[PDB]
Design a protein around this motif. Structure first.
Motif, PDB file in Angstrom:
ATOM      1  N   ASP A 174       2.298   3.395 -22.215  1.00 26.28           N
ATOM      2  CA  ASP A 174       4.066   2.715 -22.035  1.00 26.28           C
ATOM      3  C   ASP A 174       4.188   1.624 -21.017  1.00 26.28           C
ATOM      4  N   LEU A 175       3.351   2.206 -20.196  1.00 31.81           N
ATOM      5  CA  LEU A 175       2.945   0.889 -18.535  1.00 31.81           C
ATOM      6  C   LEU A 175       2.756   0.127 -19.096  1.00 31.81           C
ATOM      7  N   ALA A 206       4.252  -3.810 -19.470  1.00 25.24           N
ATOM      8  CA  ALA A 206       3.927  -5.306 -18.153  1.00 25.24           C
ATOM      9  C   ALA A 206       3.389  -6.295 -19.389  1.00 25.24           C
ATOM     10  N   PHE A 238      -4.135  -7.568 -11.388  1.00 25.47           N
ATOM     11  CA  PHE A 238      -3.185  -6.811 -11.258  1.00 25.47           C
ATOM     12  C   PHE A 238      -3.487  -5.757 -12.866  1.00 25.47           C
ATOM     13  N   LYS A 271      -5.406  -2.659 -12.096  1.00 30.45           N
ATOM     14  CA  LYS A 271      -5.306  -1.849 -11.142  1.00 30.45           C
ATOM     15  C   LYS A 271      -4.212  -0.962 -11.991  1.00 30.45           C
ATOM     16  N   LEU A 272      -3.246  -1.742 -12.240  1.00 27.13           N
ATOM     17  CA  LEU A 272      -2.456  -0.463 -12.922  1.00 27.13           C
ATOM     18  C   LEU A 272      -3.148   0.392 -14.316  1.00 27.13           C
ATOM     19  N   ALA A 277      -4.598   2.796 -11.511  1.00 28.17           N
ATOM     20  CA  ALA A 277      -3.404   3.678 -10.891  1.00 28.17           C
ATOM     21  C   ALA A 277      -2.287   4.330 -11.889  1.00 28.17           C
ATOM     22  N   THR A 278      -2.660   4.618 -12.959  1.00 26.09           N
ATOM     23  CA  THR A 278      -2.159   5.510 -14.079  1.00 26.09           C
ATOM     24  C   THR A 278      -2.765   6.434 -14.902  1.00 26.09           C
ATOM     25  N   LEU A 290       0.410  -1.026  -5.462  1.00 29.42           N
ATOM     26  CA  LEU A 290       0.779  -1.368  -6.831  1.00 29.42           C
ATOM     27  C   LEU A 290       2.164  -2.360  -6.605  1.00 29.42           C
ATOM     28  N   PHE A 309      11.224  -2.189 -15.337  1.00 31.56           N
ATOM     29  CA  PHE A 309       9.639  -1.846 -14.795  1.00 31.56           C
ATOM     30  C   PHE A 309       9.457  -1.483 -14.050  1.00 31.56           C
ATOM     31  N   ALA A 350       5.516   6.020 -12.477  1.00 30.18           N
ATOM     32  CA  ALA A 350       4.694   6.719 -13.073  1.00 30.18           C
ATOM     33  C   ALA A 350       3.044   6.619 -12.601  1.00 30.18           C
TER      34      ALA A 350
END
Ligand code: F11
Ligand code: F11
Ligand code: NAG
Ligand code: NAG
Ligand code: NAG
Ligand code: NAG
Lengths: 528, 528
Positions: free
Chosen positions: A362-363, A367, A520, A523-524, A527-528, B363, B520, B527
């Motif tokens: 959901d992140l 995004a 971007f 990485k996200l 990183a999650t 991030l 956001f 997160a």
């Protein structure tokens, strides 16, 4: 006699063909491999056993066994892509359009069709090489390769079905051009391979694969790059899908020898009928059987190869189209139809992003949403439609390609980049589809030069400019004749616009969105 | 005699003051609390012991002990904010500007100055209420409250220094207006509190605090909202900082009674001299001693209160300025100076984002960067400068305020929103600073109406429009006289522009950036 040529494999008899009030030679249907039928299916191609007697190269060959699109029965817009020959597993043939009088040692261009690795033929009217051969004094070849399960079923470890064989088919056609093209007046030391869709991905893959690097000079990629999300899979996933294909056909899943022997018994149409059933549900815009990073054809990951400079160093000309995503949305995201303006709803906009990125939480979805939502108006159907169009475009074609051209340019010897945004006056697809994936091909092959096709006089101009850039590049490594298309550098990132307005240079093609997709987002998600 | 008034606390004698070729009454320096000196420092204010005899309310009172800005010695642009009276801990006084002839029961406006809770006086020339009182027939009050350690040192649990006392000071002035304003011709049932910077945050905080809700009718917030990042801290952090303050002054840190007794011994200037030393290094745009979420003044977190509707339900008029961040950058981010165009370098742009968001990882920083970077040009100093300007603005003032107005509107009884983007013709600060934090105040208090101040005739127009909106709202709950400023609704989110061009309505104020900052980014930092 021009129509007769003697190759290392046998005498071949071609035919005279009319073109723009003139004529040229055409050797259609020359075999470069042994029919991959019977116990051959799924195996590496075998080179064609030479022959005595003259080979009739007067008519187009069979098309390979493939999925045939019937979404829009009878519609020209989609039937122009379907096979227009009889489908058969005995389909490994290439075609040659030789100028007349036959040249002594001229520029050679070899065309690799696309079709997401599940479809494609070399005999489509859009791929008629006679206009480009004639208008530019170049020997033009179009090859063919097995697609779908037939050319990409991968059971790593097995030699009966190692995978990537469709790419080997391609390489075999290329080997053939390297060995015989001189006899048709082509210079083997100056062959440019070019392709669109899976063909562009394929072109890129011969730039990477050590076993292919020496069979061509330069490359052209159109709306496809080797790293595109839909172009490859791990041996793990390939095996997973291969097993799954047997499960769909009731095959002993005991061993690879077993699996393969049943798969080998089924009639072609049987594998086609269940082949989209193995595609995992988090891969809506991809196809089942595609190239595998197997460690042989691809020594390591495409990313490390791109990163270390592990690839053929030459000049390359590539580009993308304005609305790359419309095709994918039309055939795979609900709410987009051929006859409505296909306006999308906010509620639905989000199901499309969720749909175009299952590999996100959901992140990551938020995004993507924040990045393509217009926060002041947002309940607008058109904008939402167009937003999804750009998301699917950027993510599936454009940004992978831009990542490839950025990496390639670092070690290459000249990069040329284009952005084709002309909407043909006679387009039969709807307005919301824009400049469609596949639609620059018409102009590259010069269909506009024929009046019967109802194009504008300026579109005949655009096609002529493009055809000349393409051939001039193939001949020299530079699209420009000795109004200049500038080299694409790592620093100034210049590229041109291909359309009817007068040429204009730009910079950093969709950088904003591609820095999101390329740097971007990854990485996200990580990183999650 | 107009200059004599009898209040519940004592007789008071004011003075006649000249204004725009006319005259009005002014009761300067009326005491609403007992001097918070000696054993009183850090304690809740005590109400002023009534008095006999007439109180001389002819001259401005002392300013509270505060940090004095000397970054630009002698420069008008910054000295206009410094105290222009003698600093003292005996500073709890309010001022009243009464129209003449004295009204019977008219609209009351009470001004709460700002200054980040570390600075501020009620006697600044920009806060002269005579023009607004006179031009609009309103009784105007300006209060004062302790700032810095003196008004915000928080040792939760102690009663000697519970914290938030500066806010209680404010409330005491407000209680005083509720009890005596009628004697000056003001209607206690129609008082509007308004403030800018910490004053706007303060206004918002009396909308939230149950103990304050009944002392006023409507509210106006200018470039400040209770939830702003620089406006509050936990009792935990407040205690941490209070201990740390003793460590800077060599105080027994054994117990709160100890701590407080030493802190209470030090001369004022001693606490000011080391007070910025307790600010943690990940809080570059904030100040040391600020309101605490203590469970009493603030029953729960501001966020839950905002969320549940736990706050006074009335009409509110608030807004922000174009370039809210320039002030903060000028005083706290290297590379921005009063005399250069302060162009910023890509390398440096990123140290500013890292600087404006320590509470973020590589991030979250990338995310801020991607959001404010112009990917095609990006080596541009101006754009980078302006990018940092917007980041610090959006994050510190504008987006917190927009989050507050979105939440407030859900339960309120009418919301009015403005975007002041006029750059005064006579601004002494540089061009790159734009429409500065604090600079709409000039127009609200009508300084343009005085020719000596060199404003344009149209700026006299803008000030008059604003002064009338402000007072008309205070009088009715609607800025518009019975060219309309539309209510701000949760649905249409309309707001106006305050400037010299003719009024234009807009929608969703910086939504894009505020959805990033408000929704956001948080989700992402959490997160990860
Ligand atoms: C089940 C069955 C079929 C599917 C499908 N159709 C595949 C049939 C469409 C190919 C026609 N052939 C086409 C080509 C090009 N452009 C076109 C542009 C418009 C229409 C058809 C096109 C570019 C060169 C390659 C061929 C597609 C998808 N899922 C399917 C799920 C996901 C999006 C991509 C297409
Ligand atoms: C060490 C010492 C001082 C510092 C500091 N100066 C504080 C002095 C500036 C206040 C002047 N007083 C000002 C006010 C307004 N606008 C202004 C606009 C321009 C210049 C000064 C202004 C709006 C109402 C509130 C008062 C500031 C900072 N760090 C410091 C670190 C971080 C950014 C905020 C200001
Ligand atoms: C070549 O093959 C086609 C296939 O139908 C046939 O019609 C044509 O006459 C053949 N040409 C010769 C001379 O064999
Ligand atoms: C291509 O390579 C040759 C030598 O290998 C060099 O002279 C030429 O300038 C190169 N061009 C580019 C764009 O790298
Ligand atoms: C009020 O106080 C000021 C302070 O200096 C003084 O000058 C003025 O004369 C006083 N007025 C009266 C009548 O006490
Ligand atoms: C304010 O409240 C009154 C009644 O309490 C109602 O009639 C009026 O319409 C309200 N206005 C808004 C904007 O909520």
């Amino acid at each position: 006699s021009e129509l007769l040529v003697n190759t290392k494999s046998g005498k071949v008899m071609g035919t005279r063909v009319p073109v723009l009030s003139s004529h040229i030679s055409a050797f259609l249907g020359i075999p470069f491999a042994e029919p991959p039928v019977g116990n051959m299916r799924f195996r590496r191609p075998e080179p064609k056993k030479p022959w005595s007697g003259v080979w009739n190269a007067s008519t187009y060959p069979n098309n390979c066994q493939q999925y045939v699109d019937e979404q829009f029965p009878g519609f020209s817009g989609s039937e122009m892509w379907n096979p227009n020959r009889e489908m058969s597993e005995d389909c490994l043939y290439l075609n040659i359009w030789v100028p007349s009088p036959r040249p002594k040692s001229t520029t050679v261009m070899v065309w690799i069709y696309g079709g997401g690795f599940y479809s494609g033929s070399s005999t489509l009217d859009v791929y008629n090489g006679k206009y480009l051969a004639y208008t530019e004094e170049v020997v033009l070849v179009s090859l063919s390769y097995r697609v779908g399960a037939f050319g990409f079923l991968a059971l790593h470890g097995s030699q009966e079905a190692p995978g990537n064989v469709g790419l080997l088919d391609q390489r075999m056609a290329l080997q053939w051009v390297h060995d015989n093209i001189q006899f048709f007046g082509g210079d083997p030391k100056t062959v440019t391979i070019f392709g669109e869709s899976a063909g562009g991905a394929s072109v890129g893959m011969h730039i990477l694969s050590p076993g292919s690097r020496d069979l061509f000079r330069r490359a052209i990629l159109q709306s496809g790059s080797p790293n595109c999300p839909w172009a490859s899979v791990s041996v793990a996933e390939g095996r997973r899908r291969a097993v799954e294909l047997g499960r769909n056909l009731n095959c002993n899943l005991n061993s690879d020898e077993e699996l393969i022997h049943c798969l080998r018994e089924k009639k072609p149409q049987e594998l086609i009928d269940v082949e989209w059933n193995v595609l995992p549900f988090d891969s809506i815009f991809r196809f089942s059987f595609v190239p595998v990073i197997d460690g042989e054809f691809f020594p390591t990951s495409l990313e490390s190869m791109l990163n270390s400079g592990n690839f053929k160093k030459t000049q390359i000309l590539l580009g993308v189209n304005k609305d790359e995503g419309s095709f994918f949305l039309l055939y795979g995201a609900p709410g987009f139809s051929k006859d409505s303006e296909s306006k999308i709803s906010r509620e639905d906009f989000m199901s499309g992003v969720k749909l175009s990125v299952p590999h996100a939480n959901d992140l990551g979805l938020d995004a993507v949403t924040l990045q393509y939502t217009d926060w002041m108006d947002d309940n607008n159907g058109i904008k939402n439609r167009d937003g999804l169009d750009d998301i699917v475009g950027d993510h599936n074609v454009i940004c992978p390609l831009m990542h490839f051209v950025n990496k390639y340019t670092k070690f290459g010897n000249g990069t040329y980049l284009y952005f084709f945004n002309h909407r043909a006056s006679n387009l039969v697809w709807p307005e919301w589809m824009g400049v469609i994936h596949g639609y620059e091909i018409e102009f590259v092959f010069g269909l506009p030069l024929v009046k019967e096709l109802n194009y504008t006089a300026e579109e005949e101009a655009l096609s002529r400019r493009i055809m000349h850039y393409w051939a001039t590049f193939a001949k020299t490594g530079n699209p420009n004749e000795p109004s200049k298309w500038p080299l694409f550098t790592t620093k100034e990132q210049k590229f041109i616009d291909l359309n009817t307005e007068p040429m204009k240079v730009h910079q950093r093609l969709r950088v904003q969105m591609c820095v999101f997709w390329n740097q971007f987002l990854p990485k996200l998600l990580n990183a999650t």
